[PDB]
Symmetry: C3
Subunit: 416 residues, 3 copies
Amino acid sequence: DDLLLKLLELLVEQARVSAEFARRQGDEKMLEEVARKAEEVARKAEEIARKARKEGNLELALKALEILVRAAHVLAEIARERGNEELQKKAHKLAKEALRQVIEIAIRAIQEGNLELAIIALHISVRIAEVLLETRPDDREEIREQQAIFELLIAALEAAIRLEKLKEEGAPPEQIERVAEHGLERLKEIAKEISKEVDSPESKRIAYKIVAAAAEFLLKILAEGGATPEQLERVTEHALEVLKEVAKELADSPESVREAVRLISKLTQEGLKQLKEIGAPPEQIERVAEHGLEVLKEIAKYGSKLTDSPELKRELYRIISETAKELLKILAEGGATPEQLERVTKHALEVLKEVAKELADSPESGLAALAAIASLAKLGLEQLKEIGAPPEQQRRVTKAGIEAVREIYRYGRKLY
Amino acid sequence: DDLLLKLLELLVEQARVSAEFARRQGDEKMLEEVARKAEEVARKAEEIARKARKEGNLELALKALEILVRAAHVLAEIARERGNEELQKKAHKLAKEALRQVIEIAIRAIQEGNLELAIIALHISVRIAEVLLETRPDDREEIREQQAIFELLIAALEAAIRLEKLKEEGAPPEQIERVAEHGLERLKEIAKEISKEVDSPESKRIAYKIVAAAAEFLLKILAEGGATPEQLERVTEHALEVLKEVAKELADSPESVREAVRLISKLTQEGLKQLKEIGAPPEQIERVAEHGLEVLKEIAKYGSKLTDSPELKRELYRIISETAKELLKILAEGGATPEQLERVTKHALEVLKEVAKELADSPESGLAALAAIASLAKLGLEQLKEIGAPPEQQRRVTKAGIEAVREIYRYGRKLY
Amino acid sequence: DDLLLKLLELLVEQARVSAEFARRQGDEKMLEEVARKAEEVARKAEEIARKARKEGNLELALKALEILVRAAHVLAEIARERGNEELQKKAHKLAKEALRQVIEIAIRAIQEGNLELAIIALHISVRIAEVLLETRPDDREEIREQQAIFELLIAALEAAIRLEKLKEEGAPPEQIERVAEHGLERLKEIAKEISKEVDSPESKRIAYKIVAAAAEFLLKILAEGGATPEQLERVTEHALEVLKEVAKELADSPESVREAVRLISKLTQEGLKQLKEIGAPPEQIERVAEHGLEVLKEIAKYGSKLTDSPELKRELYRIISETAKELLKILAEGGATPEQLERVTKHALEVLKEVAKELADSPESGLAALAAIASLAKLGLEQLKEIGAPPEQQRRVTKAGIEAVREIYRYGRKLY
């Protein structure tokens, strides 16, 4: 592929030189034709960039974005002197989209755990900032949002590199966890200040996603560092608590709540999977599971306060049920006893019951939630079946399931 | 070697920085001294560049050209603000020589087929264009000729990179052939429009060389791709036809014809070489040989109608005869039956006779043509002897030789 | 590692782009905040640069310096529009310190033989020159000193790369020596002209260090080139002689003598190491030893005119004695006869006596000179003991030592 990108660079640079020449000559027809070439080059680059995004070669994607930056610069240089607002609109929107895509790449680079790609991407984002700055210097809010995003990314990167070097240097876990907490606290404070600054929904969405990625990166490097599970658990709980606080600030929209749950659940699941891989005693696993479910429930409750969509409620509840199913599957893969599984299953059902009691407001949603509860009970009983649990355990869980179903039906009879 | 080039770079940059300083001081003596230093640095670079050209390291030559470009930039920048026309004339001429050399390198990069070298060369050609643009705001025509050349190189690269990828992807040879034709026909019509747009004989020479190289590359990549001989033959005809059409526009000077036939001969030689290498039946080879020879004949005629020089006529005859002799020698090395050898020998004698009938205007040119015909007969008889052909075939050939020589004398009898 | 500095690059770029935005907006508060941030970035960079200097990774050191120069550039670019003096004062001082450090690294890179590091250092020096030039274009003497240093480095590097090439080519050592001699003579004439231009003690100190390093490099490359010991000795004499000339021209301050002596001693040591490793006859070693000591005494004699510092005189005598001790150590490691040991030891005592006669001016300085020659006598006797020289040789040397002490006491009786 690289030849095509290099050709597009050659083309776009030629378009720049031809445009500077055409500006010296006053040739509006050449300017029009190179503007067409520049748009078509940008189209070729965009089409290739989506292909690179599909295949996951970040270097090519970033290079394609740099071509898009260069093409935007040429288009903007033309649009500036021509006064053509449709070119200015196109370039500005393309630059916004590039900023979005490079931010997504930056999040992905953090998620994959190589910081050099993120740094390069962030450099390209500063080029995007230069293009944006020449495009619209009066949108101080966009600039400041990009700066906030950048500042957060830099803060995350500073913690990331510091931690990565402490790991490579073989530092004592006590120093590491003090640094990690200081990182989380600083990130939280920065995010909290950013939440005072900004009002773009997408900026907040991005911000929380970055924070979540920063917590996940900490989790990854800390876990690869091989620290004793007690430290992993303590950092995890602090991270979940921070994530809950920062969500309680930043989340106030359909997508933000849905994504916040998706993130917190993902990070919970990841952390529990790390505890499973290190071979932690099930007591710690169960504490993380409960504390995670409690946090999730508190978030679900918080998010629900604004709500008017049964559809969002349905998907949220579905995600909560998927979370419970995943949690039980992790304990089962972890070789947990049926008595640990029933304790967890009971708490999970009780959380589901409480979350249904918060969320539910129609018979239709009541049925859907009930069906989810029932499906969880089915999977839970299927775990007890797979471990060959005594019939009393099966009866206990089944009765609890029936009782929860009955109580939710009593609430359903109040709603209907 | 590169350390010397690197010192020359930093010397150039120090000349730039010291020239900023000297302008800020008003130190005309320092400007004179650093201008001498920059000329001498350029002289070192020019000698090293010609050394690199002799050794065939394109990277060194290109880097040395970039040094020459940077050196020219500072020289021209000083000369412009000084009003020094001798330095301005030196810089423009040197930059034009650099443009020639980079174009030749770009053609060589197409010939060697590593398109990354062609990309790097093309990038340096953009740098040449930038310095030229800062040199000549007035000669927009020369700049536009360079742009046309660049656009042709770009078109060639679009075909080249498309084809390279299309064969990396292992596509149907027929789909490849449709793309290759679309490349050639687009290139040809572009070249025709370029032939209207430009007027420098050398620019047209360059353009034709590029077109020839584009066909040559397509042929080489297609043949290395293992496409069946029918595709090679079809493309070869189309390529010859293209070369013929563009030559019929461009054949306005002695060396233009000489080059045109040389390039047609090259394409023909590569054609037979690939048909030999793939193991095609001599049936295809002999058809292509006839095609190439008759195109050559019609071009040789056409160029002769546009021209008068005795030495050109002599050279054209010589080249045509050497071409025919080499093509017959290739067919004989290709192991074809004696029948194909005599068929081609007869056709070649007829071509040479027609060429004599077009060219000949002095007893000396008659004798030279006769001597060439005799040399062709000698080589033909030598190949019939080496394959051990029946004596009747040998006699048939020498009789045809005498008959041709008789007809040459019957023409010459009008002049003598 | 590098990523830390890359974050600093991002912060620098961000500081620039935000400061250009803040200049479009009139945001004095942002300018103040980013200026503080840029100073803190420079603080981070300075500490990292000290760490790199300690670890001796020159690639990192040069990277860190370049990024420091970038940080200085943005700091100055902000301070210029602000009209702030203290930032300009800081930047100018820091840039001079960076120039000093990069020059030291350039000397070290000449020592470590990979001239690409010296080229990168030289590139950074040109970047420093741009920063200095945009900082204070009226401080022309500093710029001209940097130019003199650059010119000297260029002269050295041109000889260096020429020798590297002739050595790699396998040129006859006589031609290499002719080139090296011409290099040294050219370097001396340059150093003379530099000494006619400059008056900064540090500039002369740097200059002489560079000259000494150039001779040292020439010696090392010629020795690696396998030249016969006679050529090494002839070059060594020319080197000592030219080092003496340039030292005498440049030196008018205390540490300059101490360093000059140290450098001459180093070049003497390196020469003796070559003759020892190649297995030269001790006759050549004894010539080099005498010639070095003779020159050292000429320099010590010259230097004695410049100051009354007792500490300096004691240091010079100390270094002279260390030189004699090292010379004996090398001669003994060379397996030379007790006759060579007495020949050299006698000269060593005598040149020490001359050095005492020139330098000493007090009872305390007499006792120091005495103490040193007595220490030399102790080592000399220890060498004659370790080689197992016959008691008569031990006694002959011991009496000569006592007589040197007697002569020193004859002077001591006039000093007290």
